[PDB]
Amino acid sequence: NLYFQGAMSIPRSQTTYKKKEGILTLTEDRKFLIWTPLPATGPPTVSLALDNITNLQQTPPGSAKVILKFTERPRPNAEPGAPPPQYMFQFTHPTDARAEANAIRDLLSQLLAAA
């Protein structure tokens, strides 16, 4: 009968989006997935509300690249045959790219179930 919220810290992952290196994390309130290009002192160039995320995919282990792919809910007036918005982040920490991908994946999946 208790209620439990997740308490794992929010990770800051070194990731490439559209060929530029950056940082992938969540906002402190865990309601948006955000990517900011390096140096990460400007605002994020990608904000994905978790309320709008419909799918989370990854490249399998042993792949050339560690990438998570996030699929979103269709835009309001998108055409009925169009593919839904997708956002790929390549993990580029030389030793920890997969571990970093699994951390974020696990935390996003926890947060997505709970909503």
Which 16-35 positions form the footprint of Cl ion (CB under 5 A)?
none
Is 42 strand, coil or helix? coil
For residue 61, the partner it binds in Cl ion, K ion, none, with Cβ less than 5 to 8 A by kind, is: Cl ion
Is residue 61 part of the contact set for Cl ion (CB under 5 A)? yes
Which is nearest to 91 in space by CA: 31, 27, 7, 11? 11
Q: Which of Cl ion, K ion, none does residue 60 bind to, with CB < 5 to 8 Å depending on kind?
A: none
Q: Which residues lie across from 58 on neighbouring strands?
A: 68
CA distances from 96 to 103, 104, 110 (A): 10, 12, 21
Mask: binding to K ion, 10-49, rule CB under 5 A, as x and -? -x--------------------------------------
Which region among 9-17, 30-38, 52-60, 83-91 touches K ion (by CB under 5 A)? 9-17
How many chain residues touch K ion (CB under 5 A)? Answer: 1
**Residue 93 makes contact with Cl ion by CB under 5 A:** no
Own/partner long-range contacts of 32-39 (Cβ < 8 Å, ≥24 apart): 33/70, 33/108, 35/87, 35/89
Q: Which residues here bind K ion, judged by CB under 5 A? A: 11
